[PDB]
Design a protein around this ligand. Structure first.
Ligand code: FMN
Ligand code: FMN
Ligand code: FMN
Ligand code: FMN
Lengths: 197, 197, 197, 197
């Protein structure tokens, strides 16, 4: 089964999560795992001035999403929705929609926020779009034990992995957050192989 | 694979839809299909005096949900949520949650409304609960061609089948609506057999 | 203006929050503030055996909601929805709906969860029902400074105040959580007086 | 009071609805109504070649939103979310967010879809973003009697006005749909004047 980890990141938090998701998915033998980012929509000069992070991941095309058995989408929140960059990219999948190209493929979502608020809404609003394409939606539930720990500030929900970046973006994804992300990658890839071989 | 069509219906619109879902599911070789309703929560006298419909489907226990590979949940809307009956029943699945009993099982949802409003929100808000149980959520997308037909008033969404009961409850599920319902059962039962034999 | 704080609580977390909300609302001169609970739906013997908390607040009727200019709803989560008790109560407001009795009245929501997951979904899914009644929906945004603090585990979202009860229910609402709850009460009551005098 | 009808439209269906919203709002004595569109994000050549409609409304800046007492947002759906154009624009309101510039301002939403699916989710997912800004969210409920009419295919929800463009975009907003749109503008403008003079 082929598993695409497709993400948008400005300051690297989602990028770090995406690598963890891919690390989990890769544990599944017979899962072929690929990490790509959506295009930046900001002018390059404004991106740089804002202190955005340069990223090694190849830039995806909308069309190539059809090549995968499972797609795990990562996006930071923008006021409780996916980012404009991820939205713009998904708005370019009308050809895929019309051909039923993503129908029955697995979909799962992970997110990042500054201070936690909107992390659930970002994931479930993204599920809406996945459903229009007839993708099978994969939440993570409470298999990841870290979800029971309320001793430290941490992202992660039953809807999908998340990270808390801090108001000023200075936090890095924690061990527990990354664990949950790895689990989500393992679980989705396992399902993809179960379904598609 | 074993498929439970689990529903609440007061006036029979969801009951009718549930039978169509079960019909569709039973078309799949290897699928064992069972239809049950959740308990009424209204006092029986008030149920009858409001004109509630007597139903032949047996009443489910929370515990028996563990026995199935796929559960297709049907509920009328109550102001854009699942009904109190369905909510009260799902509130009794804490034991199943604690044991991971529904984890990884397929889930899908169908709804009914008087005049359309809330039919999407009923489905997607039900998905939230399914996700807490770690169920794999199955939307129907646009595979059912009736979804393209805007020439007549018609339930059905990419999130799941729906029916429009009319303001006074006098409408009966239409052929197009029942077709989408059958498609949903068949599709989900197919996935269930693919995953579980 | 008359402000109803209407809540459901099994173990007292929402009850504690509700009192804080009422404490905030009462700071607004010319706001008349009342706290009531929805009926328990569990058999009394099962409630007691589960270690449920007895509560002094009077039990509301559905009809009396019409008497208020603003209603602030509190409910614990059940898998990312409002509780069956709150759902059952709201399912009894069909008379109010048909008469437009809650139309244009202010609505706001607060929630409680064991470990955080579902706290956003509980609030926004509740908003759906409020919208069917034509209630004006009042989120709190980020006026409450505590929402910026990620140094300690704490509830509170831009959608409404929340508390984290812990997996075993042993946590009590924190100073920061209660502050946010008080703010929500103050803010809603201020709006109610602005609108209705 | 000042009312901004802020919209995105590619083929004019939301543009038509926006004009009706503005018509309704202008009926309120004391309401100053302004209609503006968000910037196109598609390359101009691709916009034209796809048959995009030239529009007379001026393009808004993020900054000018601060000048209004009520903002009524219109967007077509993109797979059950707001359009990338509207998302990209709202993503540029971080400055306004940081200063509390939209806090306590009225907000309301209207949508358009090809065949109905996603019209509710578009509205409610837009509400999420409004809530992060602390805006007071205004659904329309069932005040508009057309919402009771299931005899013809018709947009409109208790969450806000909608229109059905048809699979091929050839439908024009109907009289019933435009009536609901006008009602929404009038209602929101009335609240704006009540609160702000
Ligand atoms: C336009 C905008 C909107 C934002 N909205 C929220 C929000 O609603 N809640 C939150 O906690 N953080 C919010 N943030 C913070 C971002 O989610 C955060 O910077 C992002 O998760 C960092 O991930 P990245 O490093 O992968 O880009 C917002 C930031 C921007 C620029
Ligand atoms: C409490 C209550 C709330 C309702 N809310 C809505 C609603 O938001 N939208 C709608 O179209 N119909 C609404 N209705 C209509 C029911 O959804 C409708 O009667 C039901 O779908 C019929 O299905 P059934 O025959 O399976 O019971 C409501 C009915 C009741 C009793
Ligand atoms: C049926 C059931 C479902 C629950 N679902 C969740 C959940 O999804 N997320 C969560 O963090 N806690 C969940 N809990 C915990 C409750 O939300 C928690 O006990 C409640 O917030 C306590 O508030 P109270 O003291 O006011 O009753 C659930 C508890 C029960 C009994
Ligand atoms: C990328 C894309 C996604 C779309 N998704 C949906 C959809 O989920 N449901 C639907 O009914 N129409 C969908 N459509 C149709 C648009 O919502 C429709 O063309 C729009 O409402 C027309 O409004 P406008 O004339 O103001 O641009 C989609 C169109 C595009 C281009």
């Amino acid at each position: 089964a082929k598993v695409l980890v497709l993400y948008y990141s400005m300051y690297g938090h989602i990028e770090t999560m995406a690598r963890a998701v891919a690390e989990g998915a890769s544990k599944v033998d017979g899962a072929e795992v690929v990490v790509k980012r959506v295009p930046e929509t900001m002018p390059p000069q404004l991106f740089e001035k804002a202190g955005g992070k340069t990223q090694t991941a190849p830039v995806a095309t909308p069309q190539e999403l059809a090549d995968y058995d499972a797609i795990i989408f990562g996006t930071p929140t923008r006021f409780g929705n996916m980012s404009g960059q991820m939205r713009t990219f998904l708005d370019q999948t009308g050809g895929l929609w019309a051909s039923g190209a993503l129908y029955g493929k697995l979909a799962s979502v992970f997110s990042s926020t500054g201070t936690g608020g909107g992390q659930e809404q970002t994931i479930t609003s993204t599920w809406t779009t996945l459903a229009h394409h007839g993708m099978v939606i994969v939440p993570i539930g409470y298999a990841a034990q870290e979800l029971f720990d309320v001793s430290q500030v941490r992202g992660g929900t039953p809807y999908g992995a998340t990270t808390i970046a801090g108001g000023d973006g200075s936090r890095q994804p924690s061990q527990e957050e990354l664990s949950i992300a790895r689990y989500q990658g393992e679980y989705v890839a396992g399902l993809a192989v179960k379904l598609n071989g």
